[PDB]
């Protein structure tokens, strides 16, 4: 069994401490550190803890996933190694805790598997590497590099090289990495995999990047818009659906070689996109990224590979047929982001929802007067606007569960009510002298 | 004319060498053309030419009744009306807008009297630049040495009295370094001229003492914000149209209809009376600023409050405006909405005597209690649809308000504030 193999790696690598990882409703990693003597208990009856943290009655159990056992490559003190285990949350009786984000994606994937569907995701993870002043993080870029720039213009080549190496040691396959448009911005794209593996790997990337950045006196951040006037970090999600082993989005006889299932999936996602934005763009800062002038999509449209739209259908066909949903940012909870896209996309397929016409023209160049005539909508401008749209979307509330949906609304409203009352420096700079 | 002869007599007496031809833009900011006293005869006669882009070729028409010597050789002031080169009045001038709305009210025998309570802050200056640090650590109705600004306030009131200004009283307000100067009531035009003069005088005397006076609605987070509570009454043929000794609470039907009209268009009026992005950081619960759309007697802090004094002192206190508003437009908007209430006989909602702030949301839902706009864009969208206020203020003024407010909102919306970095940078 897998448990035997885990104990074999423990003795071989001299593992002494194990981190029982899990994630709250906001995508923040949480854990319980246990000595290796308690590993047998963790894989058996499980370890008890207070699940108040998940919300961000109290007694809950951690159920480690044996497939996620990985040794942390940063060797601990004096040859003693550390290991991690991604855990599912269960109630004391044994039934799964429906408030756990990982359980939510698992449920939505099981409902898709009933209809022979399996969703594969391949995200493009953008992030910034900032300097640290007096031990505290800042928003000052480490390098003054631009798109696909090379060293010495790109100073973060060593750290990025270490990130990709550390990931490959943990059964991770990376496609390519490069410097992005903004100063100190970078991107690491990894290959497609099932939504659950992908979500686990997204959490691991953020953890690894932030850990290795601190080792070099830097701070890695996946914040959507840390600097005004420059490009913001996005999480473009390449998505494809696979029915009975074959790619359900490929039809060689249909026009553009795009199957009917793809058009319905796009139609479903675009129908609930205003509600999905509350999950995929969950911070108040996420809406400072959704502004015109940068690579981020703001208008609700879909097109081919020759236009920067919300959904893009790349040229590659065959097994690589897919859609690139470009609205999410890397601060979203990946477990809930993929669950929301899968539920909206499958409703598209089930109800045969036809998507709008493919806008191939440049949407920013088109006049606002013409957009209303075509029928082109806009994504929510504020977090409150997206939460109000999410609150009404009965499908996403049921797909994510009432517990998770309520927690998202409570956290977002608490942040919005605090942000809206604040007096920002822009207001003093604009009015104090004159008024 | 003899007002002109009177002006030249004061010139020779106080040895006045320069005259300021003051006027105001759509945003209530004072603008002026400095001319030597040799050109004063030309200003009072054919007028002085200037580029009209500032209000958002025109002539300045000084009002001889507004000639005042600046108490700080000697300098003098003249509030001017704007006209186009041919002679017709410029309908984009804020002072001309209030005059037009007052003339329309006068044709129906009505005259509006306003008495504002002007709140403001006095802040320290660091390296010749203004800050939001209170000069004093005082509180409501506080006395020296807790109130360190009693000498500046003393000078403000004094200087104002030297320019034909009657001040009712002055006191320290709730927040640190906040003060209030309430002056007697007068017709909407004289009051709006007086409001502009106060702001000019207070900011000038504050600089003389190395301080900075500001009429910003919410310069500091977590403390009280500055408001402009406007005491308003309507007069019909010399008598107070709001007093009826036989009616309940001794309030006339005209008061209830005027209140009904103001409350009907209050969401649109907020774009004029609360015109800055910062104005909506003041319209938050927990401070003396009204947020819910209600009207009540003197025992409750509501949007409209009907004080106990009766007879000729019958009035309503509209507490939603802030002192950063253009007074010429703020009074014109209130007069037009209030007169539509009187005209169309619009009944106001039931007076809410309970403490709204303590009431549950589900309760307010039953009472049908509305909320004021939460953002500047939200108020501008409501103002854009209010056909009455757009016609009352004129298409030129209404368009200019919308253009300046959306330019500010589109710049504010895209900005990344420090709060966001403090909240997300370390964790995400
Ligand atoms: N079928 C798919 N479903 C979801 N994502 C995909 C799919 N194919 C590729 N992607 C994602 O798109 C990115 C680039 O696509 P790519 O052109 O490399 O496809 P590929 O040539 O078949 O190689 P790979 O399968 O490793 O992505 C990758 O990071 C990957 O995660
Ligand atoms: N008819 C009115 N309309 C608007 N405001 C008024 C009116 N009467 C008084 N006020 C305001 O009330 C303040 C004084 O309060 P109060 O009304 O109790 O005294 P008053 O004797 O009735 O009026 P005043 O102080 O002007 O002589 C003044 O600053 C004035 O601006
Ligand atoms: Mg891309
Ligand atoms: Mg007060
Ligand atoms: Mg008051």
């Amino acid at each position: 069994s897998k448990e035997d193999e885990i104990f074999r790696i423990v003795e071989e690598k001299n593992v002494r401490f194990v981190r029982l990882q899990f994630v709250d409703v906001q995508g923040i990693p949480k854990n319980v550190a246990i000595p290796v003597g308690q590993l047998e208990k963790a894989l058996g009856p499980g370890i008890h803890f207070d699940g108040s943290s998940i919300e961000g009655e109290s007694d809950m159990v951690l159920r480690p996933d044996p497939d996620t056992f990985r040794v942390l490559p940063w060797s601990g003190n004096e040859g003693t190694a550390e290991a991690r285990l991604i855990c599912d949350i269960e109630l004391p009786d044994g039934k799964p805790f429906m408030g756990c984000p990982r359980q939510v994606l698992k449920k939505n994937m099981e409902e898709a598997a009933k209809l022979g569907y399996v969703m594969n995701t391949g995200p493009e993870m953008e992030f910034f590497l900032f300097k640290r002043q007096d031990g505290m993080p800042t928003n000052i870029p480490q390098d003054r590099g631009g798109y696909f720039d090379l060293a010495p213009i790109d100073l973060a080549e060593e750290i990025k090289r270490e990130i990709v190496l550390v990931l490959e040691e943990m059964g991770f396959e990376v496609e390519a990495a490069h410097h992005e448009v903004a100063f100190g911005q970078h991107e690491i794209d990894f290959k497609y995999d099932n939504a659950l593996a992908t979500a686990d790997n997204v959490i691991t990337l953020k953890y690894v990047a932030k850990t290795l950045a601190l080792q070099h006196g830097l701070h890695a951040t996946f914040m959507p818009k840390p600097i005004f006037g420059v490009n913001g970090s996005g999480m473009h999600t390449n998505t494809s659906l696979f029915k009975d082993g074959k790619n359900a989005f490929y039809d060689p006889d249909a026009p553009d070689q795009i199957s009917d299932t793809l058009r319905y999936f796009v139609g479903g996602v675009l129908k609930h996109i205003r509600a999905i934005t509350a999950i995929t763009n969950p911070l108040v800062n996420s809406y400072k990224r959704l502004v015109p002038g940068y690579e981020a999509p703001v208008y609700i449209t879909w097109s081919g590979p020759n236009r920067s739209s919300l959904i893009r259908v790349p040229a590659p066909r065959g097994n690589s047929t897919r859609i690139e949903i470009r609205s999410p940012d890397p601060s979203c909870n990946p477990y809930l982001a993929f669950a929301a896209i899968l539920a909206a996309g499958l409703d598209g397929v089930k109800n045969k929802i036809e998507p709008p016409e493919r806008v191939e023209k440049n949407i920013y160049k088109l006049t606002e007067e013409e957009r209303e005539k075509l029928g082109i909508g806009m994504l929510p401008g504020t977090l409150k606007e997206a939460i109000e749209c999410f609150k009404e979307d009965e499908l996403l509330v049921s797909a994510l569960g009432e517990h998770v949906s309520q927690s998202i609304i409570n956290v977002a409203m608490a942040d919005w009510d605090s942000y809206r009352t604040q007096v920002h420096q822009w207001e003093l700079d604009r009015y104090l002298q004159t008024y």
Side-chain angles (χ1 to χ4, degrees), chain A:
Chain A
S1 71
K2 299 146 175 182
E3 289 85 350
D4 300 67
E5 178 61 10
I6 290 170
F7 283 106
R8 193 207 66 74
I9 300 178
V10 162
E11 302 187 50
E12 199 204 346
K13 291 279 225 163
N14 192 46
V15 175
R16 314 292 338 268
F17 303 118
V18 186
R19 304 207 166 283
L20 303 186
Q21 292 194 358
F22 66 101
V23 294
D24 65 1
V25 186
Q26 299 146 80
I28 304 308
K30 308 293 178 169
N31 86 136
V32 184
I34 70 173
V36 79
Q38 295 288 291
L39 181 63
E40 199 176 8
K41 160 141 127 196
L43 303 167
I47 295 291
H48 281 261
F49 78 104
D50 171 18
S52 300
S53 61
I54 303 153
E55 324 321 320
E57 192 66 18
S58 311
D59 189 18
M60 290 188 204
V61 187
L62 285 160
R63 307 306 302 212
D65 190 320
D67 299 315
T68 71
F69 181 80
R70 298 285 142 73
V71 182
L72 297 185
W74 40 86
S75 82
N77 305 338
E78 302 173 0
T80 64
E82 215 157 300
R84 79 90 184 269
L85 271 162
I86 299 184
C87 300
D88 280 311
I89 316 306
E90 270 186 3
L91 291 148
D93 52 20
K95 50 168 189 123
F97 174 60
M98 304 189 299
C100 176
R102 196 174 133 92
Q103 291 289 174
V104 166
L105 177 63
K106 275 189 160 180
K107 180 192 83 197
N108 279 261
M109 289 195 342
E110 291 165 9
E111 292 187 353
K114 280 202 175 209
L115 321 175
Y117 287 124
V118 63
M119 181 174 71
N120 286 336
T121 45
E124 303 175 7
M125 298 290 283
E126 290 181 342
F127 64 95
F128 276 94
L129 276 174
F130 296 140
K131 292 174 150 168
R132 278 190 102 103
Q133 273 174 10
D134 304 335
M136 292 296 144
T138 78
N139 61 338
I140 300 288
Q142 170 246 10
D143 67 68
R144 289 179 76 81
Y147 215 6
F148 290 72
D149 260 324
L150 181 65
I153 294 170
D154 185 3
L155 286 289
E157 286 197 345
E158 193 202 300
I159 180 178
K160 279 189 303 184
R161 192 196 297 121
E162 285 176 19
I163 289 169
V164 176
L165 203 65
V166 165
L167 295 169
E168 294 198 310
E169 276 154 88
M170 310 181 63
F172 210 145
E173 295 175 352
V174 188
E175 189 92 53
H178 60 90
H179 197 300
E180 251 306 320
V181 194
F183 290 134
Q185 196 180 32
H186 309 304
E187 187 181 287
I188 291 179
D189 318 330
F190 39 107
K191 175 175 183 171
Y192 79 86
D193 205 345
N194 66 75
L196 186 64
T198 302
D200 286 351
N201 304 353
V202 159
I203 299 297
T204 303
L205 178 87
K206 296 183 201 172
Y207 168 50
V208 165
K210 289 177 110 54
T211 297
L212 296 169
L214 200 184
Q215 281 177 13
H216 293 285
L218 301 174
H219 174 74
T221 182
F222 293 86
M223 202 175 159
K225 194 73 155 194
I227 300 160
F228 168 76
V230 311
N231 198 43
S233 294
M235 177 168 123
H236 310 72
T237 307
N238 288 296
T239 308
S240 69
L241 213 51
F242 266 58
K243 177 137 165 295
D244 304 327
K246 294 174 180 192
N247 195 319
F249 284 176
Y250 182 53
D251 189 336
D253 310 325
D256 221 325
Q257 295 170 87
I258 45 169
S259 88
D260 292 355
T261 312
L262 185 151
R263 253 176 293 102
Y264 305 130
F265 196 96
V266 177
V269 167
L270 295 178
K271 180 172 200 188
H272 310 103
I273 197 70
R274 284 189 51 92
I276 298 166
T277 307
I279 310 302
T280 54
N281 300 82
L283 311 187
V284 169
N285 186 242
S286 309
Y287 300 82
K288 310 304 177 76
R289 182 222 170 200
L290 302 175
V291 296
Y294 313 92
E295 326 219 302
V298 50
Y299 295 106
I300 305 169
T301 175
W302 78 301
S303 80
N306 315 101
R307 170 69 44 239
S308 279
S309 36
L310 202 158
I311 295 182
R312 291 172 90 248
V313 187
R317 291 285 179 279
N319 210 62
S320 300
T321 314
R322 53 171 201 262
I323 63 169
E324 191 188 347
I325 307 160
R326 310 178 66 260
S327 77
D329 54 56
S331 67
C332 72
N333 185 326
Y335 299 101
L336 307 180
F338 301 153
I341 296 174
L342 179 59
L346 281 188
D347 176 57
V349 165
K350 177 184 157 274
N351 291 8
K352 276 144 209 303
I353 301 168
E354 221 63 47
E357 219 60 50
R358 295 212 306 186
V359 184
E360 300 299 337
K361 306 180 139 180
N362 216 301
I363 305 103
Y364 310 97
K365 300 183 153 200
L366 276 81
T367 321
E368 186 178 3
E369 295 275 300
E370 295 181 347
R371 303 199 228 103
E372 185 174 3
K373 314 279 209 74
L374 268 298
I376 293 322
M378 293 216 326
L379 282 172
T382 74
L383 175 57
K384 175 191 196 218
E385 276 186 43
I387 289 288
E388 274 164 12
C389 283
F390 171 74
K391 202 179 254 232
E392 318 317 310
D393 200 307
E394 249 189 314
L395 177 59
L396 296 197
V397 176
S398 160
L400 305 180
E402 313 312 280
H403 197 98
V404 165
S405 291
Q406 198 55 232
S407 196
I408 280 149
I409 298 168
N410 287 4
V411 165
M413 279 342 278
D415 279 12
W416 182 260
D417 288 332
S418 177
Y419 166 80
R420 72 177 252 268
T421 58
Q422 274 291 343
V423 175
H424 309 117
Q425 189 62 43
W426 181 92
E427 301 167 61
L428 294 171
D429 292 343
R430 190 65 147 229
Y431 306 120
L432 183 62
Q433 185 70 58
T434 313
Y435 295 86

